[PDB]
mmCIF file of N, CA and C in Angstrom:
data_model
loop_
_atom_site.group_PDB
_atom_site.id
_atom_site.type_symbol
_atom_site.label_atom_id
_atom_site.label_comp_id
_atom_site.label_asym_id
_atom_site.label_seq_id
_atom_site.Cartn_x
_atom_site.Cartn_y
_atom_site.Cartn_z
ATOM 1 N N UNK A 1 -183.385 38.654 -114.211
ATOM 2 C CA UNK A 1 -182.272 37.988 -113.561
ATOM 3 C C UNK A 1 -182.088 36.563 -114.043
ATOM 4 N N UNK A 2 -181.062 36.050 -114.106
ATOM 5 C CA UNK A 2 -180.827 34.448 -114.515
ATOM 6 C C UNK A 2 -179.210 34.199 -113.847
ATOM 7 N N UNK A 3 -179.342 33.160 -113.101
ATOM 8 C CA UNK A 3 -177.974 32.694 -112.382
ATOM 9 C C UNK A 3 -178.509 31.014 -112.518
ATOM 10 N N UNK A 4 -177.165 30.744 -112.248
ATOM 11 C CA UNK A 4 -177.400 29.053 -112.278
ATOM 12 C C UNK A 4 -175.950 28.520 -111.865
ATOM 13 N N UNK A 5 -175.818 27.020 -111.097
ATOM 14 C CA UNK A 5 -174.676 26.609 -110.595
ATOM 15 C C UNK A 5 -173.842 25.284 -111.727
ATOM 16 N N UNK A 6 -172.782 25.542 -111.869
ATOM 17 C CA UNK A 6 -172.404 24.549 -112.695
ATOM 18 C C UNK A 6 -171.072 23.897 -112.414
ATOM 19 N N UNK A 7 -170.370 22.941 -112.914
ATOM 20 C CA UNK A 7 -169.123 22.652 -112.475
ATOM 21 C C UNK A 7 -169.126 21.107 -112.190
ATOM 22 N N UNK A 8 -169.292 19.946 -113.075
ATOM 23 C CA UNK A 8 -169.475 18.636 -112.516
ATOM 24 C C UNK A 8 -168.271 17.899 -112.518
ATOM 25 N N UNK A 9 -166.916 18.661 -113.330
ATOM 26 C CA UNK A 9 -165.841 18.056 -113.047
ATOM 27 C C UNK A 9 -165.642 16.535 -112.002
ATOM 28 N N UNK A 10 -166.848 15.678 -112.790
ATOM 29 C CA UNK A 10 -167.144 14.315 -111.956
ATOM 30 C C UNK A 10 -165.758 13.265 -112.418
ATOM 31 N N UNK A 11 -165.091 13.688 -113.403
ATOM 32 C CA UNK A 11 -163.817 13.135 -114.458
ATOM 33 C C UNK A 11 -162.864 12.887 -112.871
ATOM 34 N N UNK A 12 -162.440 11.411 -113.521
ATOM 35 C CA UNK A 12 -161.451 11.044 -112.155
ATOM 36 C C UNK A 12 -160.884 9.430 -112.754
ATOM 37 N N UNK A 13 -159.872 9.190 -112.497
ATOM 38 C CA UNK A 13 -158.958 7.910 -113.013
ATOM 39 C C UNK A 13 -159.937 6.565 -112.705
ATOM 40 N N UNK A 14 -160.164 5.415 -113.027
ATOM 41 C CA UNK A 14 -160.885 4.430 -112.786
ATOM 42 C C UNK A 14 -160.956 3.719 -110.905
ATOM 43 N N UNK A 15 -161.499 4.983 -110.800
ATOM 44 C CA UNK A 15 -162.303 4.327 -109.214
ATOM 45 C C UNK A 15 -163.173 3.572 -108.778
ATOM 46 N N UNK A 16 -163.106 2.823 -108.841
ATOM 47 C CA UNK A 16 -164.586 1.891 -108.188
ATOM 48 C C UNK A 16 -164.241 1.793 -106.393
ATOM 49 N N UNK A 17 -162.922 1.379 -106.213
ATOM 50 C CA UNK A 17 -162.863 0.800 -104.758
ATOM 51 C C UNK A 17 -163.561 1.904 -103.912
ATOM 52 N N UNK A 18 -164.807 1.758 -103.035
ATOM 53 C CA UNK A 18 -165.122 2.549 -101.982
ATOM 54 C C UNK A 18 -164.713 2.589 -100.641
ATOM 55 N N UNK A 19 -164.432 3.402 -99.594
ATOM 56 C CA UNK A 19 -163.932 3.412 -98.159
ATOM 57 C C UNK A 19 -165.370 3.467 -97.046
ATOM 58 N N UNK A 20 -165.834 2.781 -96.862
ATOM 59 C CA UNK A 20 -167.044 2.778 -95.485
ATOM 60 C C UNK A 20 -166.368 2.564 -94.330
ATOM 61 N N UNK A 21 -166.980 3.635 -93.371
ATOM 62 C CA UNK A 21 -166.498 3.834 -92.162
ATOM 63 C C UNK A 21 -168.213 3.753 -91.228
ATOM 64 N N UNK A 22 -167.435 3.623 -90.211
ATOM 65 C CA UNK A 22 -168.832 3.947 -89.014
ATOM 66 C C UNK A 22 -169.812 3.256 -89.251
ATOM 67 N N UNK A 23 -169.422 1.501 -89.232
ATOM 68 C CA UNK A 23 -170.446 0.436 -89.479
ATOM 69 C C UNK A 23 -170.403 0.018 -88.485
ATOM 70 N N UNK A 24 -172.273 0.329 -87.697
ATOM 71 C CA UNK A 24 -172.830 0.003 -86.643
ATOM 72 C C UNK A 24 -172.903 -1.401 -86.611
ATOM 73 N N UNK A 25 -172.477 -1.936 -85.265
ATOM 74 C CA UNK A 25 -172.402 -3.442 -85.142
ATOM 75 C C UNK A 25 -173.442 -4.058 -85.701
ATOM 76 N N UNK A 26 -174.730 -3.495 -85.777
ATOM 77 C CA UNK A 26 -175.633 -4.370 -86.226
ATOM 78 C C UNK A 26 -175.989 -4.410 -87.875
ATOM 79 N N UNK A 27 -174.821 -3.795 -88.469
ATOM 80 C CA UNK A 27 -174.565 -3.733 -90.178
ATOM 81 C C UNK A 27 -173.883 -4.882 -90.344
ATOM 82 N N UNK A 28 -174.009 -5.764 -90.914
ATOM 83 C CA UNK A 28 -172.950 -6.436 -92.019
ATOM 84 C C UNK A 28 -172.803 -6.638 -92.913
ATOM 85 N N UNK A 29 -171.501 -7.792 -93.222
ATOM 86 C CA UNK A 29 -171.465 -7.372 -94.348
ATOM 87 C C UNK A 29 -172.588 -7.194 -95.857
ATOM 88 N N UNK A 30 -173.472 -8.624 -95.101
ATOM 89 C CA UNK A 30 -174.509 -8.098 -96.252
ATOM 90 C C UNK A 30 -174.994 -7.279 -96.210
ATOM 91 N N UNK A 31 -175.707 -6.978 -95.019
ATOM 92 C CA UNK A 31 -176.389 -5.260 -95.103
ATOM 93 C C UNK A 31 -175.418 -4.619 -96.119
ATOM 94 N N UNK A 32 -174.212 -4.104 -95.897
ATOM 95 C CA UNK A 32 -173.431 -3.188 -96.613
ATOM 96 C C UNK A 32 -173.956 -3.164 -97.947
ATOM 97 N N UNK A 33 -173.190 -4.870 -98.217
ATOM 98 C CA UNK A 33 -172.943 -5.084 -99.812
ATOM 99 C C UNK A 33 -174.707 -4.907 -100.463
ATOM 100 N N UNK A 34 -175.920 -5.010 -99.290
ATOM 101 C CA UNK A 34 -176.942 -5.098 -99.613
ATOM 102 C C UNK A 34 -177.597 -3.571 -99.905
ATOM 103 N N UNK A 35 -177.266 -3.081 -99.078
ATOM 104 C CA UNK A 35 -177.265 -1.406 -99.336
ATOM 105 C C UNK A 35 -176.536 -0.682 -100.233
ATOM 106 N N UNK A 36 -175.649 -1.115 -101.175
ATOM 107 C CA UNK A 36 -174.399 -0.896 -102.582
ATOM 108 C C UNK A 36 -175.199 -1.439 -103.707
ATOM 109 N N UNK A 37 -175.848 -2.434 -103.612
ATOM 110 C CA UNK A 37 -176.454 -3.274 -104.708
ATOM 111 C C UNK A 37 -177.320 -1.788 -105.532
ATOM 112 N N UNK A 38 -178.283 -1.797 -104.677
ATOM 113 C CA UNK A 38 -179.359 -0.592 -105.403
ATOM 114 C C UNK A 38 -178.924 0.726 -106.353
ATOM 115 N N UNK A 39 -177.073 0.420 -105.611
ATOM 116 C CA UNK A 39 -176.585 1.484 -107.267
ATOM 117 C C UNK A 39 -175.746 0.609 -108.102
ATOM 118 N N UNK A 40 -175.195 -0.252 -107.812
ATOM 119 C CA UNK A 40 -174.812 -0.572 -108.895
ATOM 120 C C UNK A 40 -173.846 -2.117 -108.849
ATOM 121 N N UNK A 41 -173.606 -3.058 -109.481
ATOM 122 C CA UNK A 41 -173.331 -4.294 -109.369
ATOM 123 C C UNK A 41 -171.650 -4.287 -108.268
ATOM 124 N N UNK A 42 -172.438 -5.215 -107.613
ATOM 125 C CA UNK A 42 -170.249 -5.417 -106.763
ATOM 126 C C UNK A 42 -169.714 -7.045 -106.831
ATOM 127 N N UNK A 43 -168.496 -6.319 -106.797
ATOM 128 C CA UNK A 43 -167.393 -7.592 -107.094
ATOM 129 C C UNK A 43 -167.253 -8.404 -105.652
ATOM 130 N N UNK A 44 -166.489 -6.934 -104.778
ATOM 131 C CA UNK A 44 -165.939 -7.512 -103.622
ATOM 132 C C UNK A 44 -166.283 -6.241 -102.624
ATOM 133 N N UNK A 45 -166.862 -6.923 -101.759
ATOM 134 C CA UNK A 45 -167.985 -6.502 -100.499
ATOM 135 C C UNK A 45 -167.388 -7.084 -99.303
ATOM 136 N N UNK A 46 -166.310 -6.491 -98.408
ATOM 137 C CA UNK A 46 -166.657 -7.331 -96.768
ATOM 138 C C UNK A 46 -165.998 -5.869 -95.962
ATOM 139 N N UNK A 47 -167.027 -6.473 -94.907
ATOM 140 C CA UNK A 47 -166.455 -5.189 -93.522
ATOM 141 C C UNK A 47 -165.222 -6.058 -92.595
ATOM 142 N N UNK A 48 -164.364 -5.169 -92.172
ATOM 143 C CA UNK A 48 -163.242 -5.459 -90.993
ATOM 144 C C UNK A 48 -163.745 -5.918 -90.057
ATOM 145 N N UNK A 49 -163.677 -7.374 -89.447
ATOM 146 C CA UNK A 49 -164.158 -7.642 -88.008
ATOM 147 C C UNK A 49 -163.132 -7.923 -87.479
ATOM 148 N N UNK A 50 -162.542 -7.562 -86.287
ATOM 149 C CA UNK A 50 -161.275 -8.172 -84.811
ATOM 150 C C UNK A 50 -161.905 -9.449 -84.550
ATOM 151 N N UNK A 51 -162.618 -10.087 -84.957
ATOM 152 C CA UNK A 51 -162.865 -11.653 -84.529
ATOM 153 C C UNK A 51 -164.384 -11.402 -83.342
ATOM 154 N N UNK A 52 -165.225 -11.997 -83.814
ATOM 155 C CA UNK A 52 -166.531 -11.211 -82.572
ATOM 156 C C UNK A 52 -167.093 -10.235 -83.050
ATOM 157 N N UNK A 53 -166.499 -8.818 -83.125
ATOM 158 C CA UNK A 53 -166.889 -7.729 -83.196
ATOM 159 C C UNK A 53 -166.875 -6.903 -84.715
ATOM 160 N N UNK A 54 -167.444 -6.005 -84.994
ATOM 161 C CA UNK A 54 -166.953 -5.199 -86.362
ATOM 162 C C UNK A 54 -165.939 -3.977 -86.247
ATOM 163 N N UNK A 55 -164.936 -3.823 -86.370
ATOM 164 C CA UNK A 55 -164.181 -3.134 -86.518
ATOM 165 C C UNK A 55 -164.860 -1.273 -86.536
ATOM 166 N N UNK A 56 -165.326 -1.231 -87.589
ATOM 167 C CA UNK A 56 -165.858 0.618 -87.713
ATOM 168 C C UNK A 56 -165.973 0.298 -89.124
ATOM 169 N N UNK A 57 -165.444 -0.465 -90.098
ATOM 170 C CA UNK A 57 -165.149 -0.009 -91.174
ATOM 171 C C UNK A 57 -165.380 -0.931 -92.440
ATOM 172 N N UNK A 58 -165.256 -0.994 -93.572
ATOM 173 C CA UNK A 58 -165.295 -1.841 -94.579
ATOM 174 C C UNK A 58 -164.990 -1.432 -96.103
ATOM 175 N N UNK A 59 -165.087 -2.349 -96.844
ATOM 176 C CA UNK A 59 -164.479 -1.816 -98.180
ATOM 177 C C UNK A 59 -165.726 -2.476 -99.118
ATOM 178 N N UNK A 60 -165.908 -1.476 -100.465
ATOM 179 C CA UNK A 60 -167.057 -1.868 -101.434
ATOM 180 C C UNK A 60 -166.279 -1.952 -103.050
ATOM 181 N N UNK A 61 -166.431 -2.706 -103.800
ATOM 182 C CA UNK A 61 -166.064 -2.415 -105.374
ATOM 183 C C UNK A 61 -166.862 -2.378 -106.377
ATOM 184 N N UNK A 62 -167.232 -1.658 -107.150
ATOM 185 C CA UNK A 62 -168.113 -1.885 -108.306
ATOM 186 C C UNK A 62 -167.948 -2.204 -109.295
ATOM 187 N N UNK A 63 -169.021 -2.588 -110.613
ATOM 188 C CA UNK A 63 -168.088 -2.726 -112.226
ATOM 189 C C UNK A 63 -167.843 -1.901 -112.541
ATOM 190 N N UNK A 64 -168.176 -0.591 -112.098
ATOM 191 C CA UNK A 64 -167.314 0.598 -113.013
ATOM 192 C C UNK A 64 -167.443 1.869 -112.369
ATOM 193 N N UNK A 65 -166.492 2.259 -111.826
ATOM 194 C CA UNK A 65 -166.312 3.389 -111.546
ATOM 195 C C UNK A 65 -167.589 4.491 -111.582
ATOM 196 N N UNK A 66 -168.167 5.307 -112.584
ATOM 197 C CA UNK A 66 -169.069 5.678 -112.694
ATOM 198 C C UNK A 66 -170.244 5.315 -111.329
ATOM 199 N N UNK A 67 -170.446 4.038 -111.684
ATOM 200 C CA UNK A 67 -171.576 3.400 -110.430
ATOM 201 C C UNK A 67 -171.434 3.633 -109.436
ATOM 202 N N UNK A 68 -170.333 3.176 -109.024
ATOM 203 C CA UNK A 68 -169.400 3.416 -107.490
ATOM 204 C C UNK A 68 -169.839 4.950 -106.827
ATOM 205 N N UNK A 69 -169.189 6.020 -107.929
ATOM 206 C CA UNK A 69 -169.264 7.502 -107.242
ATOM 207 C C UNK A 69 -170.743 7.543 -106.674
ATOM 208 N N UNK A 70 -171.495 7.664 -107.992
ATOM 209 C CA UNK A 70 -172.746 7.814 -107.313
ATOM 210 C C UNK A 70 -173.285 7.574 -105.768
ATOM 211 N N UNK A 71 -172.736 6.330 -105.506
ATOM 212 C CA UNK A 71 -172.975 5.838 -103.908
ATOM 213 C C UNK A 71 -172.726 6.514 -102.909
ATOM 214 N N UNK A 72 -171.206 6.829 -103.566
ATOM 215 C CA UNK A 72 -170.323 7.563 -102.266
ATOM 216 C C UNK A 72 -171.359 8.568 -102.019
ATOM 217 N N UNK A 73 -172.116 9.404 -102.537
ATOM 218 C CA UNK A 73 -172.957 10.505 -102.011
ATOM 219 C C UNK A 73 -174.033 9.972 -101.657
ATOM 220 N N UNK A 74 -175.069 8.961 -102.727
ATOM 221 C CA UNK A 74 -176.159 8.667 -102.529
ATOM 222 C C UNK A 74 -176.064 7.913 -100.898
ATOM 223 N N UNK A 75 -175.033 7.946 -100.553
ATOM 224 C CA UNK A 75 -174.836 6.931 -99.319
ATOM 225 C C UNK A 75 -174.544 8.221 -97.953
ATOM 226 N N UNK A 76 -173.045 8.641 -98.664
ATOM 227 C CA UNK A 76 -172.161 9.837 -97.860
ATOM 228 C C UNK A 76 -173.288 10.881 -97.064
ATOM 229 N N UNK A 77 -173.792 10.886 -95.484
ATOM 230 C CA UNK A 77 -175.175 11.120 -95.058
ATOM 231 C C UNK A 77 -176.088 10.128 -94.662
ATOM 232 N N UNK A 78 -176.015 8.898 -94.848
ATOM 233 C CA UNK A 78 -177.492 8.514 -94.997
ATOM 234 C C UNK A 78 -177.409 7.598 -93.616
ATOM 235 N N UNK A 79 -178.327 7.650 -92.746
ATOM 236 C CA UNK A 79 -178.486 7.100 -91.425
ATOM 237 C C UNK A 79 -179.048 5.976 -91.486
ATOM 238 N N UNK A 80 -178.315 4.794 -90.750
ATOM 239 C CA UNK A 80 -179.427 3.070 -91.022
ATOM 240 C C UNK A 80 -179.524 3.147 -89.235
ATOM 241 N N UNK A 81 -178.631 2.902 -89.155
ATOM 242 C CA UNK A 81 -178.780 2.761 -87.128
ATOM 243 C C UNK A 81 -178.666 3.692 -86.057
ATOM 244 N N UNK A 82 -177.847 4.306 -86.048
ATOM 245 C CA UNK A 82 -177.452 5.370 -85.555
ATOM 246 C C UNK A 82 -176.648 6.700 -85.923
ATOM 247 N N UNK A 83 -175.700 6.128 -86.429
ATOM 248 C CA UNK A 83 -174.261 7.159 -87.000
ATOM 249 C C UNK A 83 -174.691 6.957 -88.561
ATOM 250 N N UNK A 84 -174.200 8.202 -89.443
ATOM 251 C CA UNK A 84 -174.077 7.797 -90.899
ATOM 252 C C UNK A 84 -173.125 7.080 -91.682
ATOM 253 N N UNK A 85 -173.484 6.406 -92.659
ATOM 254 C CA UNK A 85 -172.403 5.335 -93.744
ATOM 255 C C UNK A 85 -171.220 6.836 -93.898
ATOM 256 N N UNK A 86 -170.217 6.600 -93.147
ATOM 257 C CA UNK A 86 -169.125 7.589 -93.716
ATOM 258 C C UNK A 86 -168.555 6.918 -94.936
ATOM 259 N N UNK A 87 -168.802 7.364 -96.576
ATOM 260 C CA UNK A 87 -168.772 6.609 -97.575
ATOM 261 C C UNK A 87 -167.704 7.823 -98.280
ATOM 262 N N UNK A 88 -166.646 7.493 -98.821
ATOM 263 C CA UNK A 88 -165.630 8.359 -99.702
ATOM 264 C C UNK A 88 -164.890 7.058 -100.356
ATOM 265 N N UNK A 89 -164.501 7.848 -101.583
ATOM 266 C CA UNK A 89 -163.528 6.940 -102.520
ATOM 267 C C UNK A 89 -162.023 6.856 -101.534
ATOM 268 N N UNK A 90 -161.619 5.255 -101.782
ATOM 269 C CA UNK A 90 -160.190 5.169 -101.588
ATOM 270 C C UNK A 90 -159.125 5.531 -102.413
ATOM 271 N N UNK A 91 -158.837 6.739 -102.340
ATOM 272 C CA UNK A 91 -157.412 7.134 -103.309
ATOM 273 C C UNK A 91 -156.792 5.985 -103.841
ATOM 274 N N UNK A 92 -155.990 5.403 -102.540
ATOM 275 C CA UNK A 92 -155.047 4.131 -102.627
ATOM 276 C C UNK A 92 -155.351 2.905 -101.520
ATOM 277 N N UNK A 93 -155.070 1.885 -102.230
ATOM 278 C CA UNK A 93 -155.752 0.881 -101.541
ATOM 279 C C UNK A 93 -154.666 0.185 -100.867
ATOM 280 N N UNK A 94 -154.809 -0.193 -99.476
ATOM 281 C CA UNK A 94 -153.576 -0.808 -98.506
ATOM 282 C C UNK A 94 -153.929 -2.313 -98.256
ATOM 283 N N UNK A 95 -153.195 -3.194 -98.822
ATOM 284 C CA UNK A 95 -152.797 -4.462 -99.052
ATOM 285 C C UNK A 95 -151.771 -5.216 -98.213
ATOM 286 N N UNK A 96 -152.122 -4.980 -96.937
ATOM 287 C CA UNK A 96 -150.973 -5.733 -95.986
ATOM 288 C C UNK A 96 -151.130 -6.892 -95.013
ATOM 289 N N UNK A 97 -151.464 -7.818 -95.706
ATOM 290 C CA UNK A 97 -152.012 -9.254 -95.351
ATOM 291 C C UNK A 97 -150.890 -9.536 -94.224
ATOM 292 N N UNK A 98 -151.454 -9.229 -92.710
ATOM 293 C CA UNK A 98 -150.381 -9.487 -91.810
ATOM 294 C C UNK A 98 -151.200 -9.156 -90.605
ATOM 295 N N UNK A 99 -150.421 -10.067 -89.289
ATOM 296 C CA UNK A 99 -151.192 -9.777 -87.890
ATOM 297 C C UNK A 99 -150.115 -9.974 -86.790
ATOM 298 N N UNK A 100 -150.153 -9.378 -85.957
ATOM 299 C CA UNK A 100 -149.845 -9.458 -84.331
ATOM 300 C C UNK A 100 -149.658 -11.159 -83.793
ATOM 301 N N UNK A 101 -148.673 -12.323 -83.816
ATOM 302 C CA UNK A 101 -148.859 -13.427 -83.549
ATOM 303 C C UNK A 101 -149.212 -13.458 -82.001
ATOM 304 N N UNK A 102 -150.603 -13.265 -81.718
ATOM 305 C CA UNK A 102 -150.581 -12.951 -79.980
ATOM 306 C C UNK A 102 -152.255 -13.699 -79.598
ATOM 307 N N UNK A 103 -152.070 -13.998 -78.904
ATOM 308 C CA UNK A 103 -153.650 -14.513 -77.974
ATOM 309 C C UNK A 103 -153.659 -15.407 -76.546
#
């Protein structure tokens, strides 16, 4: 008998930007960007805070694409506090420098 699994179709347009979700209040941003380092060099590292608090979420970039993917899995699973780094590539990246004038 001989079987074996194959298929790495890892080929994908120049992704680096990563999507992190489900960052336990007691993550930040360095933790994040500190937990990204070990695969591979970053540009631009910060999590979403409402002012006080952390949002859920944050964004990671690498020098090259290649590096980046790796994370998304080596990460995508992996438990620091409670909940796991929900880690996936951002298709498209949303750029809308704007707020609620309210307080």
């Amino acid at each position: 008998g001989s079987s074996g699994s194959s298929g790495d179709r890892i080929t994908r347009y120049q992704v680096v930007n990563l999507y992190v979700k489900n960052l336990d209040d007691g993550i930040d941003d360095e933790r994040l960007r500190k937990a990204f380092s070990p695969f591979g060099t970053i540009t631009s590292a910060k999590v979403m805070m409402e002012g006080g608090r952390s949002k859920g979420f944050g964004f990671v970039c690498f020098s090259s694409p290649e590096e980046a993917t790796k994370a998304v899995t080596e990460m995508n699973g992996r438990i620091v506090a409670t909940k796991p780094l929900y880690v996936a590539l951002a298709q498209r990246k949303e750029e809308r420098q704007s707020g609620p004038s309210s307080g």
